[PDB]
A paper describes a structure:
Cyclin-dependent kinases (CDKs) are typically described as regulators of the cell cycle. Generally, a [name] forms a complex with its associated cyclin. This [name]–cyclin complex is active and acts as a serine/threonine protein [name].
Full-length GlCDK was purified with crystallizable quality under standard purification conditions. Diffraction-quality crystals were obtained without the need for optimization. A 1.85 Å resolution apo data set was collected together with a 2.0 Å resolution data set for the AMP-bound protein using an in-house X-ray beam. The relatively high sequence identity to several human CDKs allowed determination of the GlCDK structure by molecular replacement. Residues Glu51–Thr58, Ser147–Glu151 and Ile168–Ile178 of the apo structure and residues Glu51–Gly57, Ser147–Ser150 and Gly167–His175 of the AMP-bound protein were not observed in our structures. The weak electron density for residues Ile168–Ile178 of the apo structure and residues Gly167–His175 of the AMP-bound structure is consistent with flexibility of the [name]-activation loop. The unobserved activation loop contains the Thr174 residue that is phosphorylated in CDKs for full [name] activity; human CDK1, CDK2 and CDK3 have the conserved sequence TFHEIVT which corresponds to Thr160–Thr167 of CDK2. The inhibitory phosphorylation sites Thr25 and Tyr26, which correspond to residues Thr14 and Tyr15 of CDK2, are observed and are unphosphorylated in GlCDK. A superposition of full-length GlCDK and human CDK2 shows the expected structural homology of the proteins, with an r.m.s.d. of around 1.26 Å over 266 Cα atoms. Although the overall structure is very similar to those of the human CDKs, the sequence deviations in key regions observed in this study indicates that it may be possible to selectively inhibit GlCDK.
Author numbering: 11 to 50, 59 to 146, 152 to 167, 179 to 308
Write the structure that this text describes.
Amino acid sequence: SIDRYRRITKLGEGTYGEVYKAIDTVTNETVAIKRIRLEHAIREVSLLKELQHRNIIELKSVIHHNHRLHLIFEYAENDLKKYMDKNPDVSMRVIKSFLYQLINGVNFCHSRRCLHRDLKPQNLLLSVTPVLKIGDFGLARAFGTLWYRPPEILLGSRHYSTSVDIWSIACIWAEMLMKTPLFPGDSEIDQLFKIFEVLGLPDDTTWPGVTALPDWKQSFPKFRGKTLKRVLGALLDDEGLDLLTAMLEMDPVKRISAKNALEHPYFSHNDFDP
């Protein structure tokens, strides 16, 4: 279609290629256009059109013309990083709303067997309390910071489960509360150290199979764990700390599902905007 889109304004370079905003002359609405640089698909990305949910940036159209690939998405002006920068005094209610909305979107996608794999504040767009909408679900798989990366990936597991995204959510949540990243590693190993420093060094009881992961080191320091309570326990009520702890299980198989997170008592109090 791509001649349906006018006033195409480059916004920058994103993960996969250049990113633009444009006017969809059919609806007169602003849309986002992402050029997807390839070379080493259309059916696969087109399946993402089914991910229609208020907390998910809608994939509106897949345009594959003259050997180039563009995705047309719902546009959101703002994003979480920009928002947190502009709103130092953001209320706990807003944070908890954003968190619920994030988990709700993720649960929706996970229920459709669609993983994100690269959640970060930069792909949490905010539209209109703003409505949080997750961008780029499915793109990491369809097309190939460590701060939000879970330990099983850092330790070289090739298996991405739904649990990956849950980890990232907890890291994002922690950052909303702390205003600094929970685990600001500067390398895969430094990232693991940052995680282990808080959560302790795993073993084959706490995380069965961990020592058989490709990048497990027998020589890792025997971190006991500062504990999440020590790190941000001042910022969160008890139920909130319980949920975060469940999302930051290092063994991905013990990590709380998005579905169970939404069912957690933390979200039973009507003190947030869904």
